[PDB]
PDB file of C-alpha atoms in Angstrom:
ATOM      1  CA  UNK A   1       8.034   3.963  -5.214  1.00 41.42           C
ATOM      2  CA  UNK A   2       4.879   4.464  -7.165  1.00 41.42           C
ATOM      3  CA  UNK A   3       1.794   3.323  -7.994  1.00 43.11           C
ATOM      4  CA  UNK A   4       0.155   4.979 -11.470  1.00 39.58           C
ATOM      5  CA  UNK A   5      -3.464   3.766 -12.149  1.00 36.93           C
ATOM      6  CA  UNK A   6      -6.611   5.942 -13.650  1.00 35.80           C
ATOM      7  CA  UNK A   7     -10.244   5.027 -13.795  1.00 34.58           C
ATOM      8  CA  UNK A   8     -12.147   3.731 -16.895  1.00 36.47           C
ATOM      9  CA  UNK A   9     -15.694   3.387 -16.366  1.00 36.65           C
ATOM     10  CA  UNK A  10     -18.931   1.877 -14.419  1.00 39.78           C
ATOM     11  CA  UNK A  11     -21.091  -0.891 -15.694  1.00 42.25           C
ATOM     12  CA  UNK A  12     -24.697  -1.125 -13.847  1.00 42.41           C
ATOM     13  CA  UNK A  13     -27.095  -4.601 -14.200  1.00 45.96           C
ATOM     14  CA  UNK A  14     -30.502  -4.745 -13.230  1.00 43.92           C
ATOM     15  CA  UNK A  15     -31.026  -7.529 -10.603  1.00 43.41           C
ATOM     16  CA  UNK A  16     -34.644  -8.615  -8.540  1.00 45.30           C
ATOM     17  CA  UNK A  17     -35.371 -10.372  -5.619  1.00 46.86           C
ATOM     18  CA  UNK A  18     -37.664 -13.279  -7.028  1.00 49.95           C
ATOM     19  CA  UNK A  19     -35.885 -13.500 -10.023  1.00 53.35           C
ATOM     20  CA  UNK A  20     -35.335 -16.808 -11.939  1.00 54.47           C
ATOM     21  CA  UNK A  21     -31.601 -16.991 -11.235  1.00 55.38           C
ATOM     22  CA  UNK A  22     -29.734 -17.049 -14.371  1.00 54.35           C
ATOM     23  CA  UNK A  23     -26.083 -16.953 -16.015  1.00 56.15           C
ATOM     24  CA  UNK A  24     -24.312 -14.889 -18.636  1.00 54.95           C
ATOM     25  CA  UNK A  25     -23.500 -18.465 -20.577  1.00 53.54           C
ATOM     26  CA  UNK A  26     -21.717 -15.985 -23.251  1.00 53.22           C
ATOM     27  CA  UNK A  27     -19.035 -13.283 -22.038  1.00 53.29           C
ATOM     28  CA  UNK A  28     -19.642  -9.859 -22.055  1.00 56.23           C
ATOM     29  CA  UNK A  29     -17.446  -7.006 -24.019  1.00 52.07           C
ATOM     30  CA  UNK A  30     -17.162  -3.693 -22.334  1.00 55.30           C
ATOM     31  CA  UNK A  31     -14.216  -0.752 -23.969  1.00 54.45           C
ATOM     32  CA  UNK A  32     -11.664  -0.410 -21.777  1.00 54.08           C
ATOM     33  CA  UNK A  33      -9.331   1.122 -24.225  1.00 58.64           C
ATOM     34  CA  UNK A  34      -9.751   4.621 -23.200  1.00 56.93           C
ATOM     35  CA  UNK A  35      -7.043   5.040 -19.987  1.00 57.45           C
ATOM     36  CA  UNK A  36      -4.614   1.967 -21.113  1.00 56.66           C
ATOM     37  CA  UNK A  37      -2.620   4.738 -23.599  1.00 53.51           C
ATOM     38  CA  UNK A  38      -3.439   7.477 -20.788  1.00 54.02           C
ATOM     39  CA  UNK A  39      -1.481   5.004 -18.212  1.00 55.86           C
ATOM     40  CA  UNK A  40       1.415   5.381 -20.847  1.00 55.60           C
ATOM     41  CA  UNK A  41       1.176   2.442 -22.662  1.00 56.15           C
ATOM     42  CA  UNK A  42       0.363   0.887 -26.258  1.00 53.14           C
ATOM     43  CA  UNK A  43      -2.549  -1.409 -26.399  1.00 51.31           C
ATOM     44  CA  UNK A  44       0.084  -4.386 -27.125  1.00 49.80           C
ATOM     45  CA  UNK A  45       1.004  -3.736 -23.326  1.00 48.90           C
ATOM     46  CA  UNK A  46       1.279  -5.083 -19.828  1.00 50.40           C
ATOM     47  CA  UNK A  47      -1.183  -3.952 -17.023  1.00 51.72           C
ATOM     48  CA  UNK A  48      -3.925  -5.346 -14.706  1.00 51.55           C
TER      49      UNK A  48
ATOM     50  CA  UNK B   1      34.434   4.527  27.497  1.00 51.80           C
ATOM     51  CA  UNK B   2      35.044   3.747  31.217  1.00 51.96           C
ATOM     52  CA  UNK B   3      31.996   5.280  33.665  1.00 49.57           C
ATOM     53  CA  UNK B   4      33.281   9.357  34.298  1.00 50.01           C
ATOM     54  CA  UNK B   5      33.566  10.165  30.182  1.00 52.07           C
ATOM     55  CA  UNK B   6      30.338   8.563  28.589  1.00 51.38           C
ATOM     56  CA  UNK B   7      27.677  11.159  30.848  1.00 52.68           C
ATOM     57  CA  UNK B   8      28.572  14.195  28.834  1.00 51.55           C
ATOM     58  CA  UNK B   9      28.258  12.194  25.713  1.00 43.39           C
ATOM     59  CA  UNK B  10      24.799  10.917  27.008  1.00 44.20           C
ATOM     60  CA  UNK B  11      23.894  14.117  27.890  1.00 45.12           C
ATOM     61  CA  UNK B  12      24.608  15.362  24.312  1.00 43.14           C
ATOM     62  CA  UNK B  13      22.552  12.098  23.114  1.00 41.63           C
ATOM     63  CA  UNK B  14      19.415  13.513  25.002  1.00 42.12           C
ATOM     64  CA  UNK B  15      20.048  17.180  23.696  1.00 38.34           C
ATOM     65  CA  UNK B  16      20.009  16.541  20.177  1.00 40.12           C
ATOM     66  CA  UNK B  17      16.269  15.658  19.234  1.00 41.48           C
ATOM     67  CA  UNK B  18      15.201  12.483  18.256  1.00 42.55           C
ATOM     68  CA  UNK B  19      11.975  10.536  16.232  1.00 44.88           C
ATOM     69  CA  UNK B  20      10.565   7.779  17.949  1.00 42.41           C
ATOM     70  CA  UNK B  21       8.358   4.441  17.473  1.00 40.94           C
ATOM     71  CA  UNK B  22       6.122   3.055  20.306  1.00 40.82           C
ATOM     72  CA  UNK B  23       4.861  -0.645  20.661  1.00 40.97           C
ATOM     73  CA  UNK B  24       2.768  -2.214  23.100  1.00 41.19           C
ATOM     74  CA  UNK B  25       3.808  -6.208  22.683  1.00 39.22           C
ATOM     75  CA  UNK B  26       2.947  -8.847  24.431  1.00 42.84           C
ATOM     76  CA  UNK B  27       3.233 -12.680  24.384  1.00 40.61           C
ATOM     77  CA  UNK B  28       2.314 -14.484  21.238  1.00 39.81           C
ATOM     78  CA  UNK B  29       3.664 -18.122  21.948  1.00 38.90           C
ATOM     79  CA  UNK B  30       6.406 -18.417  19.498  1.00 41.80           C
ATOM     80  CA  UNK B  31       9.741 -16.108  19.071  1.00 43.56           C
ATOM     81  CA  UNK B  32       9.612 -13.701  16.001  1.00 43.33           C
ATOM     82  CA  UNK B  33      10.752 -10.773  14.393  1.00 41.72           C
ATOM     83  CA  UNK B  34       9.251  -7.602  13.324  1.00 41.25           C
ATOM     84  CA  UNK B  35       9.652  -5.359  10.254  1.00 44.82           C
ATOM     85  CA  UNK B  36       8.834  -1.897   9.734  1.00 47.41           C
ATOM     86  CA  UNK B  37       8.031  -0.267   6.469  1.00 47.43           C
ATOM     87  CA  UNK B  38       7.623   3.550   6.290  1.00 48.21           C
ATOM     88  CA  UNK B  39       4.341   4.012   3.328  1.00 46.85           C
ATOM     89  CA  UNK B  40       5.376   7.296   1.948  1.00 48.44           C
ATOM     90  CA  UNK B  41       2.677   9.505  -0.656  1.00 53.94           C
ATOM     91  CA  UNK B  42       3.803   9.867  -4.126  1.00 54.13           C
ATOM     92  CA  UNK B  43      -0.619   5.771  -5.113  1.00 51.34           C
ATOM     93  CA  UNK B  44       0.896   4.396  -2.303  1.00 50.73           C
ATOM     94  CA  UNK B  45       3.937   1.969  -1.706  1.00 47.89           C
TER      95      UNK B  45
END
């Protein structure tokens, strides 16, 4: 049938090879609100 | 259809062109079917 989808963006994080392995312990907000009225819906909506 | 009335009709069969699918199957241990989809462009389905 169909399959309608558009891009949104790229998120780049700095990484080393000796580094002290760590974790985000707080989540991370990135705008994504740009393309989910461009896909044709209201920001209320369904997607993935 | 007895045998001297069905070769014309095959022969018209053969005239008329035809699409094809190939497969090259072999054992696989248990009895199974097979589906075919046809993924047309519109992304894709």
């Amino acid at each position: 049938s169909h399959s309608h989808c558009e891009f949104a963006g790229d998120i780049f994080i700095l990484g080393g090879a000796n580094e002290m392995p760590w974790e985000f312990n707080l989540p991370y907000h990135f705008d994504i609100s740009k393309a989910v009225e461009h896909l044709g819906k209201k920001l209320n909506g369904d997607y993935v | 259809w007895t045998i001297p009335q069905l070769e014309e009709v095959l022969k018209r069969q053969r005239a008329q062109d035809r699409l094809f699918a190939g497969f090259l199957l072999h054992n696989i241990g248990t009895s199974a079917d097979v589906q075919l989809f046809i993924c047309v462009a519109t992304e894709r389905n």
